[PDB]
Coordinates of C-alpha atoms and ligand atoms in Angstrom, one line a residue:
Chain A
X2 CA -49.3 -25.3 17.6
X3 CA -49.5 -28.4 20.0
X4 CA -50.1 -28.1 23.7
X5 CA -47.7 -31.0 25.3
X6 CA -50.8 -33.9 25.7
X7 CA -51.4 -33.3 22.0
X8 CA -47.9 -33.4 21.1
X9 CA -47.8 -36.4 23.3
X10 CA -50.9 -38.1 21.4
X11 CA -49.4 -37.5 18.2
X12 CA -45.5 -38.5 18.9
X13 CA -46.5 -41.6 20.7
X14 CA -44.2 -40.2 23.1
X15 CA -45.7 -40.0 26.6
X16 CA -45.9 -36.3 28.3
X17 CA -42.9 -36.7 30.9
X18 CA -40.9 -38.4 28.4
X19 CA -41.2 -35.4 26.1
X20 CA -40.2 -33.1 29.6
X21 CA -37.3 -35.1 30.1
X22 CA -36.1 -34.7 26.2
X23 CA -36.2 -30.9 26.4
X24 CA -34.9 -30.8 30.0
X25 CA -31.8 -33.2 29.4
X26 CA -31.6 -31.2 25.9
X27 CA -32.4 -34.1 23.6
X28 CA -34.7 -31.8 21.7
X29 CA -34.9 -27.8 21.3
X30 CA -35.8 -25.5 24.2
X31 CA -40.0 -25.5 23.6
X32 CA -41.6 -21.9 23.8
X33 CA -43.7 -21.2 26.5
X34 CA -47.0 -19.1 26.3
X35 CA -48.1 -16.4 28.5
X36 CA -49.6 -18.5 31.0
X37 CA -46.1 -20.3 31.5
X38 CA -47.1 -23.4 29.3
X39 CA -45.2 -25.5 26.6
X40 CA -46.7 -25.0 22.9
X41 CA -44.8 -27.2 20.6
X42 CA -44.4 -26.3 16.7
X43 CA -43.8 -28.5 13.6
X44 CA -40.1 -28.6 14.3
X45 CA -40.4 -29.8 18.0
X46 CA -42.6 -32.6 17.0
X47 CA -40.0 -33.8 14.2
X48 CA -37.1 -33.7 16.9
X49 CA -39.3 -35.4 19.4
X50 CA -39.8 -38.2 16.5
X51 CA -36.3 -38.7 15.5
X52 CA -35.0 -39.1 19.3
X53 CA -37.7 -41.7 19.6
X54 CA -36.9 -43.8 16.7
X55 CA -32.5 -43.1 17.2
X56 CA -32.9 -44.1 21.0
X57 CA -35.5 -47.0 19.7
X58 CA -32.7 -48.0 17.5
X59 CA -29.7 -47.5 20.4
X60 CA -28.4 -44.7 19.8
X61 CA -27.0 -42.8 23.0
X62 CA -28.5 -40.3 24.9
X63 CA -25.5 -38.6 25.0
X64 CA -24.6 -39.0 21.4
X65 CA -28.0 -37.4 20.4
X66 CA -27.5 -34.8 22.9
X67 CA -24.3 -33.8 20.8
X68 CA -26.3 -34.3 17.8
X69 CA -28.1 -31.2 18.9
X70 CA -26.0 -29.2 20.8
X71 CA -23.7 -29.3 17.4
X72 CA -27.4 -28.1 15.7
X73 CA -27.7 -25.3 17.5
X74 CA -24.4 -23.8 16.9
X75 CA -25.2 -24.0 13.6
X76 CA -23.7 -23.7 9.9
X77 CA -19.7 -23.9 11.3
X78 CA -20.6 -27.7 12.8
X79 CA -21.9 -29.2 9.3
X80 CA -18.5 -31.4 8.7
X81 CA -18.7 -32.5 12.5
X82 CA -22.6 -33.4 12.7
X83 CA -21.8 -35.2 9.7
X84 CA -19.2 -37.2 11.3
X85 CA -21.0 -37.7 14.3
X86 CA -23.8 -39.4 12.5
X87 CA -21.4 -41.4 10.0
X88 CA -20.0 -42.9 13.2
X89 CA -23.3 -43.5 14.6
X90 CA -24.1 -45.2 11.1
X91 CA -21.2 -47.6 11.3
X92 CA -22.4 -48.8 14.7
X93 CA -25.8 -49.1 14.0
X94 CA -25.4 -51.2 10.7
X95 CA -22.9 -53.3 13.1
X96 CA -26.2 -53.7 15.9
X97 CA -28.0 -55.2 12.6
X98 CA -25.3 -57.3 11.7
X99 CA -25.5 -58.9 14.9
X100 CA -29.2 -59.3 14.9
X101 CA -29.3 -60.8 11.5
X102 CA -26.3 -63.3 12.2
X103 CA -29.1 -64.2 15.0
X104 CA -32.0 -64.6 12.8
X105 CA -29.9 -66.6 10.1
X106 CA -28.8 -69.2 13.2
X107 CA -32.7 -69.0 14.2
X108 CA -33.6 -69.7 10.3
X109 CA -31.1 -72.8 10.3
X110 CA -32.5 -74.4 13.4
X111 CA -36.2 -74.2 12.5
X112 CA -35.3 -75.6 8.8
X113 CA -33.8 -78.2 11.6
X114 CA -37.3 -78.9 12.7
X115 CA -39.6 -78.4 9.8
X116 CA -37.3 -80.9 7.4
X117 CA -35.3 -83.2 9.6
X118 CA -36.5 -83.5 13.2
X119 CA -40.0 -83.6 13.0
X120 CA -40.7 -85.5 9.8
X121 CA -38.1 -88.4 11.6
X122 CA -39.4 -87.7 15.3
X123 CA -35.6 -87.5 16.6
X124 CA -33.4 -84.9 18.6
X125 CA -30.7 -83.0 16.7
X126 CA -28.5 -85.4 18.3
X127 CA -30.1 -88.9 17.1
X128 CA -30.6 -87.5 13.9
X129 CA -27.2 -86.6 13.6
X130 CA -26.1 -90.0 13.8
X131 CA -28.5 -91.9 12.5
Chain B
X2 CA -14.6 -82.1 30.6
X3 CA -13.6 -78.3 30.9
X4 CA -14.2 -76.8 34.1
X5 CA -15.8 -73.4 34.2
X6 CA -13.0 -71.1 34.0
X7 CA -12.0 -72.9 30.9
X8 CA -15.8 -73.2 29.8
X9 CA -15.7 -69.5 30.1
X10 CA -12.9 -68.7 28.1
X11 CA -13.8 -71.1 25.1
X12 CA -17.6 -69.9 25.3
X13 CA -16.9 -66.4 25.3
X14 CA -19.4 -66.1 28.5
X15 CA -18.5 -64.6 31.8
X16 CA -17.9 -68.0 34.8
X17 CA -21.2 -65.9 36.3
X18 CA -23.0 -65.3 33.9
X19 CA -22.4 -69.3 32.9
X20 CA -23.6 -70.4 36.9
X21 CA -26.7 -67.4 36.0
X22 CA -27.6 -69.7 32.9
X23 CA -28.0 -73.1 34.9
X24 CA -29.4 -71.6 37.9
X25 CA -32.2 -70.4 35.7
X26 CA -33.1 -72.9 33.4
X27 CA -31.7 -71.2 30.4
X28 CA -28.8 -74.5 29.8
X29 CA -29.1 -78.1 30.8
X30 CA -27.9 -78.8 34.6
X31 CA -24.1 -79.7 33.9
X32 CA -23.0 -82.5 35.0
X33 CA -20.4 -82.2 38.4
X34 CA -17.4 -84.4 39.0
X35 CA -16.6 -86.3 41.9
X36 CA -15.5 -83.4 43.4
X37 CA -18.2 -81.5 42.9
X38 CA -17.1 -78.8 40.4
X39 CA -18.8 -78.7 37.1
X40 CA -17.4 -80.6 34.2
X41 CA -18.2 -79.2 31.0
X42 CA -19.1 -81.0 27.9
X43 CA -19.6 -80.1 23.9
X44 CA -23.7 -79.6 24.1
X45 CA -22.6 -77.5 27.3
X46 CA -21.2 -75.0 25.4
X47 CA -23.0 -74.6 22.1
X48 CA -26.0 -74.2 24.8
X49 CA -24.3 -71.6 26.5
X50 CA -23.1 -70.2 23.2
X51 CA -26.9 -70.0 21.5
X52 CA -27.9 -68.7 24.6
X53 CA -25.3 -65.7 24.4
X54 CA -26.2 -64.9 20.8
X55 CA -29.8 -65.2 20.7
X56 CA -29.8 -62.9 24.5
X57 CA -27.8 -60.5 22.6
X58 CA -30.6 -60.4 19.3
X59 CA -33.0 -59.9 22.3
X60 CA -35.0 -62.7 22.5
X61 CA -36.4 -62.9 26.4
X62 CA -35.2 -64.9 28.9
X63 CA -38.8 -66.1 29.6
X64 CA -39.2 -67.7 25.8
X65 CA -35.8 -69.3 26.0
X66 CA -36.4 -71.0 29.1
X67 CA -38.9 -72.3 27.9
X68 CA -37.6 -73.4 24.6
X69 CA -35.0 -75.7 27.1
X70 CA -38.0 -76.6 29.0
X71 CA -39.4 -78.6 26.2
X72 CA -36.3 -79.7 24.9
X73 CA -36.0 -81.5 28.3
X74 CA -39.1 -82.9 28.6
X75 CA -38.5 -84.8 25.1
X76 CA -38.9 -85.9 21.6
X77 CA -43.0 -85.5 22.2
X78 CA -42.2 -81.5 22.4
X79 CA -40.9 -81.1 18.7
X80 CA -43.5 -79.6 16.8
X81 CA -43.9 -76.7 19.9
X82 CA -40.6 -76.0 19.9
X83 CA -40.2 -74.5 16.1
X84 CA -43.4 -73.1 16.8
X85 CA -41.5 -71.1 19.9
X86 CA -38.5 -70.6 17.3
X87 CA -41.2 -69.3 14.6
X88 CA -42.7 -67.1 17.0
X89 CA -39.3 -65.8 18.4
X90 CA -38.4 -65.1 14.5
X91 CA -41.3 -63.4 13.6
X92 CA -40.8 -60.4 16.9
X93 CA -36.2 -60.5 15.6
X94 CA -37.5 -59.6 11.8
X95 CA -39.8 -57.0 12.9
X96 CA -37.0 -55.6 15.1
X97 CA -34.4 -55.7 12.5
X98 CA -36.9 -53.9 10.1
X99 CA -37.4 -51.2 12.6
X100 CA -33.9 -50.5 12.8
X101 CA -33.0 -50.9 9.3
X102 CA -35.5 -48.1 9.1
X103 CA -33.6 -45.7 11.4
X104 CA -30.2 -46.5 9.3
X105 CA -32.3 -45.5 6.1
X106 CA -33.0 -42.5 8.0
X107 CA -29.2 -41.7 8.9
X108 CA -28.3 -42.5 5.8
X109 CA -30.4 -39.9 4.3
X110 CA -29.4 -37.6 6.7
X111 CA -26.1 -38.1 5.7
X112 CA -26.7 -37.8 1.9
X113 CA -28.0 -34.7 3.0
X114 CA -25.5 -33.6 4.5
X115 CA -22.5 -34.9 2.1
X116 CA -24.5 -33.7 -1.2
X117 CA -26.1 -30.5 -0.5
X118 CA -25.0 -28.4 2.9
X119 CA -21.3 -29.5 2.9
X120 CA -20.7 -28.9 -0.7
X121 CA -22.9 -25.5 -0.8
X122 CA -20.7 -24.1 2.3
X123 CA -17.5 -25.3 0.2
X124 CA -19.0 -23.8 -2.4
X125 CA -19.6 -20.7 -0.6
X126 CA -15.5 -20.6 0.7
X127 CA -14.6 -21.0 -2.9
X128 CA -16.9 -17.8 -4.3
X129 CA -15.1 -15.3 -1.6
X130 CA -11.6 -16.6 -2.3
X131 CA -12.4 -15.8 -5.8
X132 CA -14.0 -12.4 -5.6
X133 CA -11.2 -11.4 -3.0
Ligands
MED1 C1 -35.3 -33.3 13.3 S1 -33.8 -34.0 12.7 C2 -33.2 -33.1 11.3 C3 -31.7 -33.3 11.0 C4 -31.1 -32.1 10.4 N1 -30.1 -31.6 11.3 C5 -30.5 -32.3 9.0 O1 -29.6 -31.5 8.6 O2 -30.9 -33.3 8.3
NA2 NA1 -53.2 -24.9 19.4

């Protein structure tokens, strides 16, 4: 198992930012040896990667915290943890939506440039006219 | 002309966040009336609304003032602003790509979940109705 600087070295995730996962309960409660330090198993590192890449994508703190807590009650919160991240699905697919509406307007402008503006030299607004 | 409340309405964009937009560089200084109140124009708002949607996709507040920057200083800046668009397209597609990866990931998840644990519990339900 991982002491937390490894764990830290290998998540990406930096040291207090793993202490603040487990402490707000983003992630599992981490054993602790004899000496009173973390040592973090294959589990803890997947959870440590997944709340990276859902809060990386916007999910919630406190929707993740659910995610978990629902987890850890175990088999009787299947249909609910299901739910929870079909909800989560719909407004993340929404979030991309957005962003590529964005990127499409950004790919219409620069065909702007590289086939009307620059070849004639002219603002949007002269060229329009012409 | 619209003044800025209607401005505001039409565009979408809070009156503050509109007088934020100016004041920074991110839209063209608007023109003011006799009075001294802004008047708003057409190329007012579809500034104010590219700025809205592209602040929204993420693109910083230091590359879009820019971007206006050059567009003010003339027809001589052209080829360095869809260079600035290019660039600012490039860093949008990567962060679209990162989070279509995390929806693969809840979808799978979710397969998971709907294919295999829900049905096996159901499953389960079903066995000790009818051995009982
Ligand atoms: C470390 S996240 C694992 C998600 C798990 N609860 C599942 O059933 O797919
Ligand atoms: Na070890």
């Amino acid at each position: 198992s991982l002491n937390i600087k490894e764990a830290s070295e290998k998540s990406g995730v930096s040291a207090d930012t793993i202490r603040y996962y487990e402490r707000i309960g983003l992630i599992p409660p981490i054993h602790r040896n004899e000496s009173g330090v973390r040592k973090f198993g294959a589990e803890d590192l997947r959870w440590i990667l997944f709340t990276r890449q859902m809060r990386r994508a916007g999910l919630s703190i406190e929707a993740l915290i659910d995610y978990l807590a629902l987890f850890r009650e175990g088999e009787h919160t299947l249909e609910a943890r299901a739910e929870l991240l079909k909800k989560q699905r719909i407004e993340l697919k929404n979030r991309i939506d957005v962003m590529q509406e964005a990127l499409d307007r950004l790919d219409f402008k620069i065909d702007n440039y590289d086939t009307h503006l620059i070849p004639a030299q002219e603002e949007l607004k002269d060229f329009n006219v012409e």
